[PDB]
């Protein structure tokens, strides 16, 4: 599982 969307990097 990856942080696909850039909005999820701060989570």
């Amino acid at each position, epitope marked *: 599982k990856l942080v*696909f969307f*850039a909005e999820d990097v701060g*989570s």
Partner: antibody
Amino acid sequence: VQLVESGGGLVQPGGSLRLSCAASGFTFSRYSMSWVRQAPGKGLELVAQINSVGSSTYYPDTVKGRFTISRDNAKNTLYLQMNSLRAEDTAVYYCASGDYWGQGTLVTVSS
Amino acid sequence: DVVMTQSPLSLPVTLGQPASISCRSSQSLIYSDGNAYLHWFLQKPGQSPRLLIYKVSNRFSGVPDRFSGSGSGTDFTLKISRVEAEDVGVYYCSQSTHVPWTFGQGTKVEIKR
């Protein structure tokens, strides 16, 4: 990691449908989710996009004001409430976390 | 809206030969964390799209070594080392830097036999 869709099928024009997705194996609450459609022999078209918690929402002007994306971070499920259905909404609807795409549920809008 | 331009739309290619799929971005894809959120997906007939490359050059789990990704800023490219019979499908480029998550028109890869 799995994404199983349900609630798809044949519907009357101007009708309503609600798609459900059972997300498994990867801490659903941590990531953004989306609904992408594909009409017969066509490309990839995003329908709705939700953030990790559910405070931000986006819909293109093709479904805006008729469709609603929602999520339950405790149940690990994603929803799409489709209303005022048109024949142009006939497509295979995938639930995607980006890196993973479910099997896709076929939606048919016909009388 | 961040528009992904793909070329060619149709890709006929001989077995074992290399292939290159171009992708232009309408703006910058570099995010604040330093990663440019540009991915490549493969969709074979009657099946769901599968992620191949995720952040410009990284390949995904189960994805072979023959697939490769390059580019920076606006211009990007997806290269195949050797075209196998199992590579027939529609390849998509995608952006997940900005909201909404967008896609390219898609490249149909064909086996020239």
